[PDB]
Every structure is written in C-alpha cells, then in structure tokens.
Amino acid sequence: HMSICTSEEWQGLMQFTLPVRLCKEIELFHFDIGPFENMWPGIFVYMVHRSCGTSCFELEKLCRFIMSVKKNYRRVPYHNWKHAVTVAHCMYAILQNNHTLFTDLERKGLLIACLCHDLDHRGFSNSYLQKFDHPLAALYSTSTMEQHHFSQTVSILQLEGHNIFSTLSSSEYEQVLEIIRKAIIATDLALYFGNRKQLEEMYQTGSLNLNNQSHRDRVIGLMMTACDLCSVTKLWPVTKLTANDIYAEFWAEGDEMKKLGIQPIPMMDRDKKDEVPQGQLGFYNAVAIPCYTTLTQILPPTEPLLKACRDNLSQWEKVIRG
C-alpha cells in the first residue's frame, strides 16, 4: 500500500554534494536546516556518511529509502518532512558529541528512527483520533500515531530495494528494528514524563548503568524526546517561526473539533492566541527545561541544548512582559 519514490528522485539524490560553508555549522547543535529545503535529503545522506561512513548502507538503497520516507510525510504545518530532518540532525549532533557511548547498530538505527519518527502524520493528536474514533485509534489503542509511524517505517523497508538493513545478520536486523521501534514509541510525549522521572532517580542514586539494556533504552528514549523538541534549542528567530508552524497545526486540529461542535482546549483554539507566550513559558518550564537538564546530566556534551533552551525561555518571558 506504501508510497515509493520514482527512479529519478533517488538517482538525483545519489549525485548531490553538500556546500562547504555548511560543513562546520551542521556540526553545531543550533544548526537550522530551514533555509536549505532542496538539500534536506542530501543533508541526511551527509550525516549518515559523516557519522557512520560512506559504506554503512548501499548508496542506491539509502537514496531510495530517504526519497520514499519524504513522500510518506504529509503537507501538514508542523509534523512534516522539515521536522523529520530537523529531528535527525539533532540526533546526528548528539551522536557525534557522544562518539564512544553508542554501538554502530544504535548509531544507524537512531538516525533512521529520527527520520521516520512522524511518518504519515495527519496533523492530529492521539486524543483527537481516539475521541472522534478514527480508524487509526481502532488499530492502535495507545501511542496511536507512534505505532503507525513504526508501521510506516517497516512497510517502507519492505519495498523493492528499500531494505538498507538487508546486509545485516538476522540477529542484528531484529536488533536494529527493535531500537527503531522503541525509539519511535518514546516520541509519544505522554511517555516522556515517567521516563525522565525514572532516569533522574537512577542518576541521583548512582544506579544508572549504560551496560544495562533497560537503562540504555530509557537514555535513548530521552534522546528521542530531546531531538523531538529541539526547535526550542535553535536561535530565537528560528524558534519563533517554528512556534507559528506548531500552532498552525494545533489550531487546524481545533478548527476540526469546532466544526463538530466540540470546544477545543485553549492550546488548540485560535481565538486564544494571546495566551501563546504564557503557554510557551509553562511548556519550557514543565517539559523542555527538565528534558535538557536530565539529558545534560546523563550526557554532559549535550549541554549546548540546555543553554539554547534557557536562552529561548528568557525570550518568551520578554514577550510576556513586552
């Protein structure tokens, strides 16, 4: 049933080379992919090659995969192709800065999981799909969209010449598919609060063990949340423009509920626009800051993300105060 790229789409990507001016800034946590739309597939290939290497995936199969992933992202205001590449770039920056903590299998799984984490997003929350009994909520009871994203990732891999992991042994293939599954499910924000709480306890009690697989899955989970929210870690003009995209999607969801005679929560009500700066300050204080704080504790080189997150928070306070 899945959407596949055209021969010309993936063959075109194969050629593309990244401009040398970006070579140094792509390494930075605050790097914005925003002004380089036509380059995004090429940026992802660049990140796979710079991080993993030029021979980790057969270039043909990788370019087919990327171009098909792009096709299965909708024209929604926020959960689109741009978001997928932005999230993968944040993961790239984290992996590069913590080069001796993850396996080659984790490094490639995580980059793929990040690119596929919102695959075929309809621009609707899990609450909307569940409340209005959408076929997807009937399919997946909890973490509705997240289950669909992993399903859309598997179905893409299973297309003709799209299996980038075909060269792995049956054990390593099941292993990478498991890393991807868990990583994509962790992007359900509802799950983050408990995961971060458990990690904070393990860190404080000194019981956090990177050797223990369950502990590892939790750290990876928080890394996925940290990447998912990274728009709060860019420079203020980029952050501010991404917030407009997030609210355009929230408001479109509320317009749908209104059309059905349902009053949406203020966050999804375009008539409650004036509350956005305060809404943002609470999000930074209750979600973003704890996220990057715990991440910096577990992985100290991720500190620039906490620093940029704090800079945007003070910018939001400035807006509230005028």
Ligand X SMILES: Cc1nc(C)c(CNc2nc(OCCCc3ccc4ccccc4n3)nc(Cl)c2C)s1
Identify whether the C-beta of residue 119 lies closer than 8 Å to the C-beta of residue 153.
yes
CB 77 to Mg ion: min, Å: 14
User: Is there a binding annotation on residue 245?
Assistant: no
By CB under 5 A, the residues from 153 to 192 that bind Mg ion are 187
Active site residue 79: yes
By CB under 5 A, the residues from 232 to 271 that bind Zn ion are none
Indicate the residue whose CB is closest to ligand X. Answer: 279
Residue placing its CB nearer to ligand X in the complex, 157 or 229:
229
CB 102 to ligand X: min, Å: 24
User: Is there a binding annotation on residue 121?
Assistant: no
d(CA 183, CA 111): 10
Residue placing its CB nearer to ligand X in the complex, 106 or 228:
228
CB 74 to Mg ion: min, Å: 13
User: Is there a binding annotation on residue 30?
Assistant: no
Residue placing its CB nearer to ligand X in the complex, 29 or 250:
250
Which partner, ligand X, Mg ion, Zn ion, none, binds residue 147 by CB below 5 to 8 Å per kind? Answer: none
Is residue 269 near Mg ion by the rule CB under 5 A?
Answer: no
CB 87 to Mg ion: min, Å: 9
By CB under 5 A, the residues from 146 to 205 that bind Zn ion are none
Residue placing its CB nearer to Mg ion in the complex, 102 or 150:
150
CB 215 to Mg ion: min, Å: 24
Residue placing its CB nearer to ligand X in the complex, 50 or 122:
122
Site string for Mg ion, 102-131 (x = CB under 5 A): ----------------x-------------
* Dihedral sign of CA atoms 111, 113, 116, 122 in order: negative
Binding site for ligand X (CB under 6 A): 78, 189, 229, 231-232, 243, 246, 249-250, 266-267, 272, 275-276, 279-280, 283
CB 291 to Mg ion: min, Å: 15
d(CA 190, CA 186): 9
d(CA 232, CA 241): 11
Which of the following is catalytic: 79, 121, 148, 162?
A: 79
User: Is there a binding annotation on residue 118?
Assistant: yes
Residue placing its CB nearer to ligand X in the complex, 62 or 243:
243
Please give the structure tokens belonging to residue 41: 């597939």
The CA angle 84-154-242, to the nearest 5 degrees, is 10
3-state secondary structure the chain: CCCCCCHHHHHHHHHCCCCCCHHHHCCCCCCCCHHHHHHHHHHHHHHHHHHCCCCCCCHHHHHHHHHHHHHCCCCCCCCCHHHHHHHHHHHHHHHHHCCCCCCHHHHHHHHHHHHHCCCCCCCCCHHHHHHCCCHHHHHCCCCHHHHHHHHHHHHHHCCCCCCCCCCCCHHHHHHHHHHHHHHHHHCCHHHHHHHHHHHHHHHHCCCCCCCCHHHHHHHHHHHHHHHHCHHHHCCHHHHHHHHHHHHHHHHHHHHHHHHCCCCCCHHHCHHHHHHHHHHHHHHHHHHHHHHHHHHHHHCHHHHHHHHHHHHHHHHHHHHHHC
By CB under 5 A, the residues from 98 to 137 that bind Zn ion are 118
Which residues participate in the annotated binding site? Answer: 79, 83, 117-118, 228, 280
Catalytic annotation, residues? 79
Which residues participate in the annotated binding site for a divalent metal cation? Answer: 83, 117-118, 228
Point out which residues bind Zn ion (CB under 5 A): 118, 228
Which residues participate in the annotated binding site for 3',5'-cyclic GMP? Answer: 79, 280
